[PDB]
Amino acid sequence: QEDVLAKELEDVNKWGLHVFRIAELSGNRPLTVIMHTIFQERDLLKTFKIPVDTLITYLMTLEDHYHADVAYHNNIHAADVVQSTHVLLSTPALEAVFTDLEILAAIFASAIHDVDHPGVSNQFLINTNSELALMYNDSSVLENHHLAVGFKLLQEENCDIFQNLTKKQRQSLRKMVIDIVLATDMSKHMNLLADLKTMVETKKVTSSGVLLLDNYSDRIQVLQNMVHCADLSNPTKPLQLYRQWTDRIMEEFFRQGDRERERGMEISPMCDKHNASVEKSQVGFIDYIVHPLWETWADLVHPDAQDILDTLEDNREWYQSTIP
Amino acid sequence: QEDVLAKELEDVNKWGLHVFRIAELSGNRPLTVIMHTIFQERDLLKTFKIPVDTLITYLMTLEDHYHADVAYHNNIHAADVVQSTHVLLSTPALEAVFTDLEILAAIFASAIHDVDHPGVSNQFLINTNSELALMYNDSSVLENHHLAVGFKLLQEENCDIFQNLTKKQRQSLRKMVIDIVLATDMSKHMNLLADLKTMVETKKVTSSGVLLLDNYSDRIQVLQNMVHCADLSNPTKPLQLYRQWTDRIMEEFFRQGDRERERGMEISPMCDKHNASVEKSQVGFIDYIVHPLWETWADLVHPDAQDILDTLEDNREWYQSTIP
Ligand SMILES: O=C(O)c1ccc2c(c1)nc(Nc1cccc(Cl)c1)c1ccncc12
Ligand SMILES: O=C(O)c1ccc2c(c1)nc(Nc1cccc(Cl)c1)c1ccncc12
Ligand SMILES: [Mg+2]
Ligand SMILES: [Mg+2]
Ligand SMILES: [Zn+2]
Ligand SMILES: [Zn+2]
């Protein structure tokens, strides 16, 4: 089993990694083994003097604080978003564009971005007067919580993977990680996409053909959109992966709708298992959210993302075909 | 005691209320007695059907969560900002511009806006890796906490002063209160003032007198700047009031600087008791922050803020005269 898992992890640089199989082969530690593999691939342990035992201890603790009984927003999703961000970071149009600290921030942000997710939405937490919504004044409730937990866990025994960064490196990384995870709040999607469109329309490219990003605002905007794309990457994956992700988010949505029904609240969209259309919901999600985002990302890094966009368009055609 | 208490309460509608006397005559409950008196003057217990005993129970509970060993950001300051907001709400150029709910939101926001303040700044909390900064991801750390405490205390026994608001009224009040208190973060001052200035250059007014605000964005922005003005109203008050407030904020600042010194941190501006110029700092505070804010406000409600602006200019005159 160790051999086959190592074989599977050789695909860490590929879109379409068998992340559910890696979850199985790793003993439900996809986030730990995928993060560790990526950190070794990018030489991040040597670059930031991260003790390997500290890295594993933090990663296992972080993975533990994802909920194993949440169908979608769990450690497999976190590992998926981490690996997808890792691939997007390697795209040729971004070669040598980001520093080692920005790469570390984007990967760390992806790892923590949904930690301790309870499997219900921000609006559900707000409408039920949850403790979380009271703590965070109804504003990016979950995303603020994911950040707070992700950073707090660094203070557990032998968990401070950033112990050997300088003070300015720690300060800069913390700000970047916060800016990235707050951007995963879906209520910010339209604004994030509008800014990504503006950047594509005004794109500048250096003499070496890579993206020119000469200020923090543009650099962090690209990283925010990158992790957002990774978060919304399920419909761009091979269909056997996409359908499993769809099964899982529908189970989470239906369980939220069951709670909304039991409480006498209006049922959130796609959350009523009695009047649901899973296939129409996926086509509309692709048409109105995922394809607009990925077509814009593909424009930013053209032609690097052509195969990903082609898979997305094929999957939309397939889900559409199941409707008539 | 209670009848001398009453005659000074008589001028709750006047700039320059004797709040320190009121704090002494009330047994250190100025927030409770001033809030109660204001709700009667504006008929808020009747319009919103608030039980008078629940108003008092929550007010004493809220007042208790202000720190008695914090020289400035305590219950006396909270009572002063309440009373100043209450007066600014009667500006002629703003006669009933705001509905009864918006009036309630501005006054409630004023009461809770610094609750549980520890006497140190957001930057101190961030740079010391405090639990509060960890919870709130370095963003409006204190102001988010003030809100969360102020709302959580409503869930104590016989404290839900909003129990008889409709569910939509409770949701609308909550949103406005959050929008207002978050705007008291001094890091947002320039953005709030620039928008007040833009409103000035786009000011639409009647011939009858009043300002004309149609959309929620313009409206909440005036109330944000209103409570901001009340928060920064000390230098516009009669001089013997202003001088007492200055003694208290300098004591609080010096105690923070003593902590930045003993921890080896960079001492915040005005916090080094061995290198302080209290009078120069007041003149600078007025010149760069308080007067530009209050003169922009004065223009928006021209000319009802003329006397407040005059008194500020007089106090800047006097503080300047104390520099040799
Ligand atoms: O936040 C997540 O993790 C999250 C995760 C999954 C979905 C989502 C948000 N939002 C969806 N829809 C959506 C959301 C906002 C606006 C509009 Cl028009 C549509 C959606 C649809 C279909 N399948 C999965 C999702
Ligand atoms: O936040 C409060 O409660 C608060 C309370 C009092 C002061 C303050 C903020 N900020 C001051 N100065 C300041 C603050 C920000 C930027 C710049 Cl240039 C200056 C200041 C100066 C003098 N006296 C009292 C204060
Ligand atoms: Mg999320
Ligand atoms: Mg404050
Ligand atoms: Zn996610
Ligand atoms: Zn204040």
CATH number of the structural domain spanning residue B157: 1.10.1300.10
The answer to whether B47 and B57 are in contact (CB under 8 A) is: no
Q: How far apart are CA A292 and CA A35, in angstroms?
A: 29
Token code pair at residue B143: 């102001």
The answer to whether the CB of A57 falls within 8 A of the CB of A103 is: no
Return d(Cα B143, Cα B148) in angstroms, integer.
9
| B185 token code pair | 């973060």
Please list, in sequence order, all residues whose beta carbon lies within 8 angstroms of the beta carbon of residue A163, skipping any fewer than 6 positions away. Answer: A51, A54
Determine whether the interchain pair B137/A147 forms a contact, defined as Cβ–Cβ distance below 8 Å.
yes
With beta carbons under 8 A apart, name residues in chain A contacting B151: 134, 137
Query: Residues within 5 Å of ion ligand 3 by Cβ?
Result: A 114, 184
* Partner residue opposite A152 with nearest CB, options B134, B147, B175: B134
The residue to which tokens 């670059």 are assigned: A47
The number of the ligand nearest the C-alpha atom of A82 reads: 5
Tokens of B298: 């004065």
Distance from CA of A265 to the nearest CA of B (A): 13
CA B134 – CA A139 distance, rounded (Å): 16
Cα of B117 vs centre of ligand 4, distance in Å, is: 8
Contacts of A147 in chain B (CB under 8 A): 137
Which technique was used to obtain these atomic coordinates? X-ray
Taking the CA atoms of residue A281, residue A282, residue A286 and residue A288 in that order, the dihedral angle to the nearest 10 degrees is 0
3-class secondary structure per residue, chain A:
CHHHHHHHHCCCCCCCCCHHHHHHHCCCCHHHHHHHHHHHHCCHHHHHCCCHHHHHHHHHHHHHCCCCCCCCCCHHHHHHHHHHHHHHHCCHHHCCCCCHHHHHHHHHHHHHCCCCCCCCCHHHHHHCCCHHHHHHCCCCHHHHHHHHHHHHHHHCCCCCCCCCCCHHHHHHHHHHHHHHHHCCCHHHHHHHHHHHHHHHHCCCECCCCCECCCCHHHHHHHHHHHHHHHHCCHHHCCHHHHHHHHHHHHHHHHHHHHHHHHCCCCCCCCCCCCCCCHHHHHHHHHHHHHHHHHHHHHHHCCCCCHHHHHHHHHHHHHHHHCCC
User: What contacts A270, CB < 8 A, 6 or more positions away?
Assistant: A250, A253, A276, A281
Name, in order, each residue with C-beta under 8 angstroms of A37's C-beta and a sequence gap of 6 or more. A9, A12
For residue A216 the two structure tokens come to 């923090």
Query: Which residues on B lie below 8 Å from A170 (Cβ)?
Result: none
Instruction: Point out the ligand nearest to the CA of residue A186.
Output: 1
Contact A148 B134 (CB under 8 A): yes
Residues 6+ apart with CB under 8 A from B190: none
Strand partners, B205: B211
For the CA atoms of chain B, what is the radius of gyration? 19
Q: How many beta-carbon contacts under 8 Å exist across A and B? A: 32
CA contacts within 13 A on the Cβ side of A5: 16
Query: Backbone phi, then psi, for A323, in 5-degree steps?
Result: -80, -55
Q: Output the six-digit token pair for B279.
A: 């009078």
Domain count, chain B: 1
Report the sign of the C-alpha dihedral through residues A223, A227, A228, A232, in that order: positive
Q: Which residue has the tokens 């889900």?
A: A319
Task: Report the C-alpha gap between B82 and B80 in whole angstroms.
Answer: 5
Cα A76 versus chain centre, distance: 11
Q: How far apart are CA A22 and CA A78, in angstroms?
A: 13
Residue A211 — φ and ψ, nearest 5°? -65, 135
On whether A285 is known to bind a ligand per the annotation, the reply is yes
Are the beta carbons of A134 and B144 separated by less than 8 Å?
Answer: no
Closest in A137, A151, A174 to B147, CB measured: A137
Nearest-angstrom CA–CA distance, B18 and B22: 6
Rounded to the nearest angstrom, the minimum Cα separation between A151 and chain B is 7
- Report residue A91: phi and psi, to 5°: -65, 140
Q: Are A180 and A109 in contact (CB under 8 A)?
A: yes
Place of tokens 């029904």: A261
- Residue A263: CB atoms within 10 A of its CB come to 10
For ligand 2, atom 12, name the residue with the nearest CA: B285
Q: Which residues are CB-neighbours of B8 under 8 A, at least 6 positions away? A: B17, B18, B21, B22, B25
CA–CA dist A16, A308 (Å, integer): 10
B307 neighbors B15 (Cβ within 8 angstroms): yes
- Considering only CB atoms, B134 lies closest to which of A138, A139, A151, namely A151
Q: Are B312 and B291 in contact (CB under 8 A)?
A: yes
The single residue listed with the structure tokens 């996809």 is A30
Resolution of the model in angstroms: 1.5
Nearest CA to A13 among A77, A76, A87?
Answer: A87
Q: Own/partner pairs for B61-66, CB < 8 Å, 24+ apart? A: B61/B153, B61/B156, B61/B159, B62/B31, B62/B111, B62/B112, B62/B115, B62/B150, B62/B153, B63/B29, B63/B31, B63/B32, B65/B115, B65/B116, B65/B149, B65/B153, B66/B31, B66/B114, B66/B115, B66/B116, B66/B117
Output the CA B219–ligand 3 centroid distance in Å: 32
d(CA A245, CA A253): 12
Q: How far apart are CA B252 and CA B121, in angstroms?
A: 10
Locus of tokens 């990774």: A230
b/e string for B53-87 if b means 16 or more Cβ within 10 A? ebbbbbbebbbebbbeebbbbbbbbbbbbbbbbbb
Residue A102 burial (C-beta neighbours within 10 Å; 0-12, 13-18, 19+): buried
Query: Mutation test of ligand 2: which of B182, B289, B291 has the most ligand atoms closer than 8 Å to its C-beta?
Result: B289
Contacts of A138 in chain B (CB under 8 A): 174-175, 178
State the catalytic residues of B. 73
Contact B152 A134 (CB under 8 A): yes
> Which residue in B137, B138, B146 has the most chain A C-beta atoms within 10 A of its own C-beta, making it the best mutation to test that interface?
B137
Place of tokens 């007025």: B286
The Cβ of residue B1 has, within 10 Å, a number of other Cβ atoms equal to: 9
Where in the sequence is the domain holding A128, given as residue range(s)?
2-324
Taking the C-alpha atoms of residue B156 and residue B165, their distance in angstroms, rounded to an integer, is 17
Q: Is A65 one of the catalytic residues? A: no
- Report which of A232, A314, A316, A230 is spatially closest to residue A281, judged by C-alpha positions: A316
Task: Identify the CA nearest to A7 among candidates A20, A32, A25.
Answer: A25
Question: Distance between CA atoms of A282 and A320, rounded to whole angstroms?
Answer: 9
Beta bridge partners of B211: B205
DSSP β-bridge partners for residue A205 = A211
Residue B32 half-sphere exposure toward CB, CA atoms < 13 A: 22
CB neighbours of residue B203 within 10 Å: 15
Residue numbering of the annotated binding site of B for Zn(2+): 77, 113-114, 231
- Who's near B166: CB < 8 A, 6+ residues apart? none
Q: Which residues 6+ apart lie within 8 Å of B105 measured at CB? A: B172, B173, B176, B177, B180, B223
Pairwise CB contact (< 8 Å): A138 & B178: yes
Token couple for A38: 């990526």
CA angle A99, A104, A107 (to 5 degrees): 125
In SS3 terms, chain B reads as CHHHHHHHHCCCCCCCCCHHHHHHHCCCCHHHHHHHHHHHHCCHHHHCCCCHHHHHHHHHHHHHCCCCCCCCCCHHHHHHHHHHHHHHCCCHHHCCCCCHHHHHHHHHHHHHCCCCCCCCCHHHHHHCCCHHHHHHCCCCHHHHHHHHHHHHHHHCCCCCCCCCCCHHHHHHHHHHHHHHHHCCCHHHHHHHHHHHHHHHHCCCECCCCCECCCCHHHHHHHHHHHHHHHHCCHHHCCHHHHHHHHHHHHHHHHHHHHHHHHCCCCCCCCCCHHHCCHHHHHHHHHHHHHHHHHHHHHHHCCCCCHHHHHHHHHHHHHHHHCCC
CB A142 within 8 A of CB A132: yes
